[PDB]
Write a protein that holds these residues in place. Structure first.
Motif, PDB file in Angstrom:
ATOM      1  N   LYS B 165      -6.130 -10.283   0.969  1.00 29.11           N
ATOM      2  CA  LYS B 165      -6.091  -8.823   1.251  1.00 29.11           C
ATOM      3  C   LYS B 165      -5.286  -8.525   2.527  1.00 29.11           C
ATOM      4  CE  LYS B 165     -10.448  -7.715  -1.147  1.00 29.11           C
ATOM      5  NZ  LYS B 165     -11.767  -7.053  -1.006  1.00 29.11           N
ATOM      6  N   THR B 166      -4.704  -9.531   3.189  1.00 26.88           N
ATOM      7  CA  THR B 166      -3.775  -9.320   4.336  1.00 26.88           C
ATOM      8  C   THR B 166      -2.556  -8.537   3.840  1.00 26.88           C
ATOM      9  OG1 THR B 166      -4.446 -11.430   5.290  1.00 26.88           O
ATOM     10  CG2 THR B 166      -2.488 -10.409   6.227  1.00 26.88           C
ATOM     11  N   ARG B 167      -2.191  -7.450   4.527  1.00 30.03           N
ATOM     12  CA  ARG B 167      -1.027  -6.600   4.158  1.00 30.03           C
ATOM     13  C   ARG B 167      -0.065  -6.446   5.341  1.00 30.03           C
ATOM     14  NH1 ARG B 167      -2.578  -8.035   0.103  1.00 30.03           N
ATOM     15  NH2 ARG B 167      -2.551  -7.002  -1.933  1.00 30.03           N
ATOM     16  N   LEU B 168      -0.566  -6.347   6.579  1.00 33.34           N
ATOM     17  CA  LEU B 168       0.277  -6.267   7.804  1.00 33.34           C
ATOM     18  C   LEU B 168      -0.026  -7.434   8.747  1.00 33.34           C
ATOM     19  CD1 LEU B 168       0.808  -3.299   6.802  1.00 33.34           C
ATOM     20  CD2 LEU B 168       0.921  -2.708   9.224  1.00 33.34           C
ATOM     21  N   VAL B 169       1.026  -8.131   9.182  1.00 32.46           N
ATOM     22  CA  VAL B 169       0.991  -9.048  10.356  1.00 32.46           C
ATOM     23  C   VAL B 169       2.027  -8.534  11.354  1.00 32.46           C
ATOM     24  CG1 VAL B 169       1.151 -11.430  11.169  1.00 32.46           C
ATOM     25  CG2 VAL B 169       0.267 -10.971   8.882  1.00 32.46           C
ATOM     26  N   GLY B 196       2.258  -9.454  -1.185  1.00 31.19           N
ATOM     27  CA  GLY B 196       2.020  -8.075  -0.711  1.00 31.19           C
ATOM     28  C   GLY B 196       2.040  -7.968   0.806  1.00 31.19           C
ATOM     29  N   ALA B 197       1.878  -9.078   1.533  1.00 33.72           N
ATOM     30  CA  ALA B 197       1.838  -9.103   3.016  1.00 33.72           C
ATOM     31  C   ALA B 197       3.250  -8.908   3.574  1.00 33.72           C
ATOM     32  CB  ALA B 197       1.232 -10.390   3.515  1.00 33.72           C
ATOM     33  N   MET B 198       3.361  -8.167   4.681  1.00 31.32           N
ATOM     34  CA  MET B 198       4.643  -7.890   5.378  1.00 31.32           C
ATOM     35  C   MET B 198       4.507  -8.267   6.859  1.00 31.32           C
ATOM     36  SD  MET B 198       4.239  -3.747   5.224  1.00 31.32           S
ATOM     37  CE  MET B 198       3.358  -3.959   3.677  1.00 31.32           C
ATOM     38  N   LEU B 199       5.580  -8.808   7.449  1.00 28.99           N
ATOM     39  CA  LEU B 199       5.659  -9.154   8.892  1.00 28.99           C
ATOM     40  C   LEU B 199       6.512  -8.109   9.619  1.00 28.99           C
ATOM     41  CD1 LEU B 199       5.162 -11.083  11.272  1.00 28.99           C
ATOM     42  CD2 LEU B 199       7.163 -12.374  10.534  1.00 28.99           C
ATOM     43  N   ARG B 246       9.203  -1.461  -1.949  1.00 28.70           N
ATOM     44  CA  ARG B 246       7.841  -1.885  -2.374  1.00 28.70           C
ATOM     45  C   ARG B 246       6.749  -1.226  -1.522  1.00 28.70           C
ATOM     46  NH1 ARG B 246       7.298  -8.133  -4.512  1.00 28.70           N
ATOM     47  NH2 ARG B 246       9.279  -8.249  -5.648  1.00 28.70           N
ATOM     48  N   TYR B 247       6.965  -1.043  -0.215  1.00 28.20           N
ATOM     49  CA  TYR B 247       5.888  -0.734   0.765  1.00 28.20           C
ATOM     50  C   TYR B 247       6.036   0.660   1.397  1.00 28.20           C
ATOM     51  CZ  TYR B 247       5.858  -5.901   0.617  1.00 28.20           C
ATOM     52  OH  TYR B 247       5.879  -7.213   0.239  1.00 28.20           O
ATOM     53  N   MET B 248       7.236   1.251   1.422  1.00 25.36           N
ATOM     54  CA  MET B 248       7.525   2.462   2.243  1.00 25.36           C
ATOM     55  C   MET B 248       7.516   3.731   1.382  1.00 25.36           C
ATOM     56  SD  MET B 248      10.399   1.364   5.040  1.00 25.36           S
ATOM     57  CE  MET B 248      10.144   2.880   5.961  1.00 25.36           C
ATOM     58  N   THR B 249       6.942   4.806   1.928  1.00 20.17           N
ATOM     59  CA  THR B 249       7.002   6.194   1.399  1.00 20.17           C
ATOM     60  C   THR B 249       7.760   7.049   2.418  1.00 20.17           C
ATOM     61  OG1 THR B 249       4.930   5.912   0.200  1.00 20.17           O
ATOM     62  CG2 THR B 249       5.610   8.170   0.599  1.00 20.17           C
TER      63      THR B 249
END
Lengths: 407, 407
Positions: B165-169, B196-199, B246-249
């Motif tokens: 469930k990690t999404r942001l690092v 799904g995780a992003m750095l 994938r991640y940005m609105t």
């Protein structure tokens, strides 16, 4: 007698060197030529020892210059220094104000937005509304059947939308696609009959054309953009002491004091180099040229353009106030050519490159398509003057426009 | 042999005219002197015909200059133009990125933040977390008992905090109060084992000292500030095509295309005058001086300062890496004087005004007070060099510092 320039054309245009060329600047509502003294000021700062400054005598003189610059900009709108902050843009500052207001708002509070609002404002309050779970009570302007293309903002249209749960009312001082001056102090007095309610005014299309006094307007929040004011791409937001203490939460680091508007809204190191371009513009407008000459010069320019457009009612449909009266409207004139594309007209003028004008929605779909409603699919034609524009230019533009439409 | 300058001191310092004076610039991690060519570039733009530009030949040359400037800045970090955007500041761009990411996140997702993060980053992810109803899983750095003041960021410390469930690092490439180079590609490879995780990497303390390639780092997001890079107070954020799609609105107006990062995050008219200061800096660093000479010059400077500080272990407690090796650490050196106030030391140096240094928390309370933990109530002393600093300056600074502490 034939209308003539009020300004000394040469003296004024000495501060704007690019105005000597082929193209006349008639799209000033999208961006003005920068004041020479403003460029010289930022050069000197950027060639100087960098911020953050030291404790030495020369560093303290640079601190005095920064604080002095902010003090003059604050006095430009009759605000205290702790009541103003510099930001990226009006669009950005309105979005950050939303984040600051959000914590003390909820889904039971009501937001009223004028349909004459620039999307810079609309996007801010739509986003704030969506996050809070609010639906905006949109505030339509008033037209009369004898003046159907002259939308007006009245207290009488606002009152039905007000409730004891009203917390935000948002409108502009001037619409960038209309040019009409709205009665902000009257709107403020009505909004303030609702305890807890705050008025947020977009003054981007006002501050370049008229002297502004945020205390006489009694607005909670006022915002303007320097690049329509002979300055850099840089916003300034005003917030009353009452509005700060009662309605605003800091969006800054936990360790930063939240007493000033800077403390609440300033994200990262501010652009000192752009801020120090602003005090030269204040002294240029107020003292070098003065508001009397600026308003009188811009009024004469609007008189000559409206005179020609209203002379051919079968060709030109003029939006907004069909007089040049300074208390009523500023030098932003929107129209469409009957049975012609607004884009086609703008392209033909700009391709020739004697005059720079614009067409379209101009980042304001709600006033353009929901209020003014041009017949053209390409939207509106807009000509926007400032005090460095000449009567000779307007007279020549009227001749060129005529040639294009008479063909 | 005695260590000497690698740069041509006169040739380099010809681009930075204020460096001729009494005070040496040893607080470059808080802001550098602006590149002469950068100031000349913005002057020329601001004296030129205003944006928005027309369709004429001269206007199209100004469009080519704008697009060209963006193309070179993108190539500076090996990004495509549609993968970079200019903003007010790193603090601002990280906050706007949070707003862009928020709609596709929820209270079930996990955010991992390094405790070495600048509050510019911490504030962004604390605010995003609070809005989503998330509690941050904070990522502590590793110290070994033989090097207790040398915090390191390891993949081995990160893995226990990772879940499906990690999404942001979030971490920095370099900490502004440590100066150690973190292994970003290794961290990226580990983060990307979680689908799904992003750095998100803060590179403000990296980009001035080392060449950066965001594709070789394989980061989702990278951000830096030009005022630590001989430029204006102006941020640049990178976002990979994958991360955007994938991640940005979009946080922009409904009518603005959301394909580019500009489209998604650009609030109001951008500061073109500040952006066009940036391509001159790219060509200065890459071609005029070059990274080989910059890194070698900065390494020699760090060698001379560390040599003196580590020579007196009973007086100076040095934080970070106690070697000058370029692959290991950049020219940001933090220390405290045993049994002395860091503020008292900084004041005495700055009052004399031969050298400009700084003390305190430096907008980074978490790395300063929770990791490094100086004995001084006033926090850390920091000296930060760039390539225009000289060996003669460092040698003279070591003598002055000695005089102040030996008294």
């Amino acid at each position: 007698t034939p209308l003539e320039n009020v300004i000394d054309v040469e003296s004024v245009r000495s501060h704007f060197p690019v105005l000597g060329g082929e193209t006349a600047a008639f799209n000033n509502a999208s961006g003005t030529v920068v004041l020479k003294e403003a460029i010289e000021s930022t050069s000197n700062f950027m060639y100087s020892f960098p911020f953050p400054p030291g404790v030495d005598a020369k560093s303290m003189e640079a601190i005095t210059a920064y604080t002095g610059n902010k003090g003059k900009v604050a006095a430009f709108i009759n605000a205290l220094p702790d009541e103003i902050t510099f930001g990226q843009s009006t669009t950005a500052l309105f979005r950050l104000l939303g984040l600051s207001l959000k914590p003390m708002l909820n889904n039971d509070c009501e937001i009223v937005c004028s349909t004459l609002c620039h999307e810079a404002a609309a996007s801010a309050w739509i986003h704030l509304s969506r996050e809070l779970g609010i639906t905006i009570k949109w505030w339509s302007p008033t037209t009369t059947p004898n003046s159907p293309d002259d939308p007006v903002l009245t207290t009488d249209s606002l009152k039905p939308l007000l409730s004891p749960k009203t917390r935000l009312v948002t409108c502009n001082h001037v619409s960038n696609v209309v040019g009409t001056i709205h009665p902000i102090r009257e709107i403020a007095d009505v909004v303030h009959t609702i305890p807890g309610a705050m008025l947020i005014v977009d003054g981007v299309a006002s501050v370049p054309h008229r002297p502004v006094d945020v205390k006489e307007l009694d607005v909670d929040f006022y915002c303007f953009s320097w690049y329509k004011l002979f300055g850099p791409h840089l916003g300034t937001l005003y917030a009353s002491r009452k509005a700060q203490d009662r309605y605003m939460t800091s969006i800054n680091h936990y360790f930063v004091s939240s007493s000033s508007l800077d403390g609440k809204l300033a994200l990262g190191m501010p652009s000192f180099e752009l801020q120090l371009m602003c005090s030269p513009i204040v002294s240029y407008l107020q003292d070098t040229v003065g508001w009397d000459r600026i308003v009188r010069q811009e009024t004469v320019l609007v008189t000559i353009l409206l005179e020609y457009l209203l002379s051919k009612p079968s060709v030109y449909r003029v939006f907004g106030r069909r007089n040049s009266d300074p208390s009523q409207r500023v030098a932003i004139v929107t129209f469409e050519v009957v049975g012609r594309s607004s884009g086609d007209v703008a392209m033909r003028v700009n391709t020739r490159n004697r005059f720079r004008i614009t067409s379209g929605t101009l980042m304001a779909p709600r006033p353009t398509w929901d209020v003014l409603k041009p017949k053209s699919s390409d939207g509106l034609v807009r000509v926007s003057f400032v005090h460095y524009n000449t009567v000779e230019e307007v007279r020549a533009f009227c001749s060129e426009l005529d040639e294009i439409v008479t063909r």
